[PDB]
Symmetry: C3
Subunit: 464 residues, 3 copies
């Protein structure tokens, strides 16, 4: 009898699981919302510099209207390589955010110290890719300690995010990095194996910069790594050691698929289901970004903030429905929970996009300001040409947005807290009377090329 | 000089041949119609229970409008595995019929006894897949003996089917099976190697149930199987022993392709030809099933019935053209030749589908009742949401329909012989006056969940 | 740590490079236009006979409207095999022209003699494929010596072509070939290793026919070939010896991709970019062919003719824009530079195609007749059903046109020099008054089945 080769079957459930971390794929938690889980781990936050400027340049005539295609190609060529190293080193990519990503090594507390060495070795290999071969740099922040996960949503949509000091720290660490630095959180530094890791300290900072690894005499990284894999639940092994992810072996299971699909946008499921040409989700399109930020008294306290995020989510999704927008991503962004919402994504191109974005934003502002435990709401609104597309590796990728206007909306919400703000394109393009707005003082902002005048959306009735 | 790897070329002719058995692919018979051929073989009829109920459940809201996609995925995951075992054990899948399939081992008469052992071993391995790991069972019927093939059609369309006592028997055998039984026809039992095959007998039945194989002391199944492959014309071997089918090696040949394509529906050829997205042939769509049954004096006598089927076919295809329907499948269904016809398939969505289905059915009834050697015509008409899609394995698959309404239309034609019947959806939804119909006595029917009231389509003029 | 398999990544840049020779892919020359480069090499011009007759036959009813699909399948099955042998023997396919192709072995002058032996061995292996197994023959012409390349175009489009005596010779040689001959140019014969190559001479010709290779006693072709690969810049080797082309390894590089894409038509880039179903570029469509020929005093003198071709190109592309046509291919066609232009390609289906083709042709005629160094302009216009599609191998293929009308337009331009001519379909179908034309004397033409009456497009005003 023959034993013929079994071709890989790229079932729908496998295509879905490319868009999710192992944390969700193999999580099996309750469908109650909010749901909270607690664990320890090491986080790596990898941030590429230079793609929003490249994004702007790929709209230029030299690209002959293949800018989106060229952009995604050159982005994924680079990001794929970084995704592979994370996976090969045993990490779980949690989420892509534009030209950045967040990765997790979830381990028992006794194993943190050793796992930190693994993650540093990985981060230095990723740093390496950028010291070779046009205009892009990488900042890496590392953190370790207690992590909480929140799952929130409704009967058709699910979102997760991670919370706690390690989460805050990893972003803090990454923000300090000079171009091409690997920075460890103070807690990471405290738990790491200091006899191996040569650091230099950082100005007015307890966080530290990694110079190099200095293995002891008998040290063998492959044997060490192998010991560490004992603690790695899903590391591909044995018959599957040739795969980047165990998720590549998932088999059809309608219950699991129903649960996983709730995390993925409808337009992406259409493509997975071969109901739309692939070409069409990579685009440079004019959209409006609505970047919502919710601040709490204590943003590390999941059982306090979880209900409030769920509450906020329920209202947000309902008004976005009305005003025709979508939630692209939710994540903790030092100080708060941020929702990155988009008007004008595939299918939801309306006229009066701008007006709607503003009225939606005001509605969210009003409602969220009264949700218990939400200290402060801030919302930034910006409009322009943004890259929208699937970023990552074939085995692990997500739909995301990259552009100067995304950055602008995020920086507005931080530099102008407690109000709804908008850019000049949104202001000028809105249907709305000029006295619905206030012209704002100009602020020098980080990592935003130029704002042009900014405004507060004061809203329809007077407040003085 | 290099000897570079030769990538598999999935030519159109290879994609076409996935939809056909070796019986047709390598058959090369006359293009005259009808054409009849005679041989011996073993038949296996594998019938999955539980997918029409799953079909009904996958229309529910929990599936979030990805019911068709989820259904086909979970169906093919299972059916693919069964198709592989048949192929690996040397069989030819002849035809898929919903959630069932029919397979053939064509051999010289002296080899039947040994081949029956092979097919039993296969059937017990398939039975096995169902004793592991939600709500599906498998009934397997086996038959052996003389088989005739009929090829019928016109200058652009071809159909085949198998005929004779073994064909009748394999369906009889399968219908007796308690859930998960393997049943042998009486003739199969008579020809098999009884010293190996432990059976228990069956109530008021000469057919028998297989308990297990009980190989003699020296018996080695792999050596036995290898001996049997001497008699297997197309068993992949040598350089091609890593392939499931020799048909995977077919090379472009416009004459052969012209001949093979006549068996495949136009919408499928469009997809093969990359002129339509794959996603679109898997659907849960509202259709009307017209299940036509033709009974003859002797349904095992190919040279008698062949002309009549050809005649019936010519008229059927012509009125289906007019009323916008299609022949999905033709097969012998104890007592007669059945045509499973569909109104509302991809492209042929009209309004007045229902009326048309009824007028078409009456026309076919009238014409076929006068074709010489057609003893009785019965036609069942039912309307509802049915799964329409490609079922099977990548190397061997066919477009088919699965649903409670398909079953209903088949059961109507059998329980209400000699008339055209319809369900309540068809009745209520038709354009037609109430006195064109007669309300029928309710019959308890097998493997149909509930009919609702049924009617006879009496037709336009009175008969009393 | 795992070392998982790296799946082949079919990046856009790799898909683009399938449409271009190594000459361009790895060329990196100036973006100035015209650009001229000079080298030596051996040329092989492989011409299949019988596909324009097959093209005509595949429009017939027997093909059941899958003629385009069947045609391209059977063409590529054959042409792929020829492309593979060229690549494996170290050649660079420069260009496809319908059912023919031109291949180049670019080498230092001292290596011509040995390389000629390699190319003959290849040509005899290709001749071989046609002596096996319906109605197609192959004529092969070989030439060797000095070659110039011209790159011409504008800021969004690039074209190249090869020029010089070897180029003229290879087409001359191929035109003499009796069906299935391999003919060497006189210069090729003069440089080859005559102690190995047994020829018979040719009627009123210095060119020669290859009978066979007659290796000396110690000769080992594999060792010889290996020596020759020292001189082959891009021969796949080492880790990549399993690939047909080094171009299969190209990595994303936006500068390179911007440069390469300028050679490829927009409709093809759309398909590369997964913005259109593949099925749609293979078609049998009614088009109008405008075959422009420019003759110069000396057509081997690149620095003379290069400016004139660039000048002609600039005007041609501008009027084709206006009249909605496209340049399909440009090449030297003994005596001159020919532009094969098409009206009615994917997307550019207009009514008044015919009129436009004629007015465009007259405009080009008028303008090019005054470009300095253009001795004579001739333009042939023919309309009918032509095959339009991607021809070649997966790793090396191009969009091209095949049909009796393409041949007709080429033969008109040669047999009726110095005027614009058209066929009867174009004449009768044009919007234009009869006295805009002159009915021409009928000429017996080579390799054109029947012309029907031909006309000169005299144009709008009288000349007498
Ligand atoms: N798709 C996305 N998801 C979440 N946050 C985003 C985002 N795009 C931009 N941001 C936010 O925009 C802000 C500007 O970010 P920085 O990270 O300082 C830009 P950078 O990394 O140096 O170069 P870049 O603009 O080429 O990315 C950050 O607060 C970042 O979190
Ligand atoms: N696509 C299809 N082709 C041919 N016959 C079909 C069909 N779908 C249903 N039928 C017929 O419908 C009838 C009801 O069949 P059964 O085989 O008793 C149902 P079952 O196998 O127990 O479970 P199921 O309804 O989940 O399939 C049978 O006569 C069967 O042949
Ligand atoms: N796509 C294309 N590109 C360039 N030239 C073309 C062409 N199609 C046809 N021609 C030209 O048409 C003319 C007729 O060519 P021949 O090469 O004698 C036909 P053949 O090769 O014997 O058989 P065929 O018509 O089946 O191809 C030649 O001058 C050829 O260069
Ligand atoms: Ca960034
Ligand atoms: Ca069934
Ligand atoms: Ca030719
Ligand atoms: Cl997160
Ligand atoms: Cl999210
Ligand atoms: Cl059958
Ligand atoms: Cl059939
Ligand atoms: Cl050329
Ligand atoms: Cl060209």
């Amino acid at each position: 009898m023959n034993t013929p080769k079994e071709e890989f079957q790229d079932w729908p459930i496998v295509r879905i699981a490319a868009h999710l971390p192992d944390l969700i794929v193999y999580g099996h938690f309750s469908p109650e919302r909010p749901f909270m889980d607690y664990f320890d781990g090491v986080l790596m936050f990898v941030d590429i510099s230079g793609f929003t400027a490249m994004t702007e340049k790929f709209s230029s005539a030299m690209y002959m209207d293949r800018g989106a295609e060229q952009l995604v190609e050159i982005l994924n060529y680079h990001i794929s390589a970084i995704v592979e190293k994370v996976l090969i080193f045993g990490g779980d990519i949690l989420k892509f955010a534009g030209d950045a990503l967040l990765a997790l090594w979830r381990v028992e507390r006794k194993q943190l110290k050793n796992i930190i060495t693994v993650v540093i070795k990985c981060s230095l290999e990723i740093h390496g890719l950028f010291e070779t071969q046009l205009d892009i740099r990488v900042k890496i922040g590392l953190a370790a300690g207690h992590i909480s996960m929140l799952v929130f949503g409704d009967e058709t949509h699910s979102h997760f995010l991670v919370i706690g000091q390690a989460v805050d720290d990893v972003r803090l660490a990454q923000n300090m990095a000079q171009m091409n630095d690997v920075i460890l959180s103070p807690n990471c530094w405290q738990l790491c194996d200091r006899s191996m890791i040569e650091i230099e300290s950082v100005p007015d900072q307890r966080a530290v910069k990694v110079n190099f690894l200095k293995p002891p005499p008998n040290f063998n990284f492959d044997e060490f790594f192998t010991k560490c894999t004992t603690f790695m639940h899903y590391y591909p092994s044995g018959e599957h050691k040739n795969l980047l992810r165990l998720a590549c072996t998932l088999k059809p299971d309608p219950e699991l698929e129903m649960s996983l699909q709730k995390y993925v946008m409808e337009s992406i499921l259409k493509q997975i289901d071969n109901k739309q040409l692939q070409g069409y989700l990579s685009e440079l399109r004019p959209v409006t970004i609505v970047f919502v930020n919710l601040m709490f008294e204590d943003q590390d306290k999941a059982e306090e903030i979880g209900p409030a995020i769920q509450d906020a989510y329920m209202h947000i999704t309902s008004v976005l429905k009305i005003f025709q927008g979508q939630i692209n991503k939710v994540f903790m962004f030092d100080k708060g929970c941020s929702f990155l919402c988009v008007f004008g994504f595939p299918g939801e191109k309306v006229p009066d996009e701008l007006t709607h974005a503003l009225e939606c934003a005001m509605d969210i502002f009003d409602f969220c300001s009264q949700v218990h435990k939400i200290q402060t709401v801030s919302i930034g609104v910006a409009s322009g040409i943004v890259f929208c597309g699937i970023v990552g590796h074939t085995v692990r990728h997500e739909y995301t947005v990259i552009g100067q206007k995304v950055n602008l909306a995020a920086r507005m919400m931080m530099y102008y807290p407690g109000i709804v703000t908008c850019d000049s394109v949104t202001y000028n393009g809105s249907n709305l009377p000029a006295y619905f707005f206030k012209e704002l003082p100009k602020k020098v902002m980080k990592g935003v090329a130029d704002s042009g005048p900014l405004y507060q959306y004061w809203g329809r009735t007077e407040k003085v």
